Amino acid sequence: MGKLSEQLKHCNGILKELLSKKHAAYAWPFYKPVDASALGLHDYHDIIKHPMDLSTVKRKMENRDYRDAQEFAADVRLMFSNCYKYNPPDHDVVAMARKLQDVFEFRYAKMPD
């Protein structure tokens, strides 16, 4: 019934949408932690100090780690920022991040208050 609970329900709804089949064609690079070694990205952890991905956001939501919508939004935006920091801006994965961030920002803006 409380404001923070209602806002976190909205956040959980957004999280479910970002993980849904509707967005899977561009969301899939953000499903799991970047496996830098497996992808040959041996500079990844020198450039990205705070990795973030949607499985980590889901674990934190399930564990009641997020106390408010702003904390949730900070992790989702960190995930996008990491992609924009690491990758040249004309790379495919950046286009995919920008499309998923459009989904995120437009729905986040509909936060109940």
Distance CA 31, CA 58 (A): 10
Closest separation in Å from C-beta 93 to ligand ULB = 4
Site for ligand ULB in 25-84 (CB under 6 A): 29-30, 34, 39, 41, 83
When asked if residue 93 is in the footprint of ligand ULB (CB under 6 A), the reply is: yes
User: Closer CB to ligand ULB, residue 10 or residue 23?
Assistant: 23
Q: How many residues does the chain have?
A: 113
Are 28 and 36 in contact by the 8 Å Cβ rule? The answer is no
Query: To which residue do tokens 């064609």 refer?
Result: 25
Residue numbers of the site for ligand ULB (CB under 6 A)?
Answer: 29-30, 34, 39, 41, 83, 86-87, 92-93
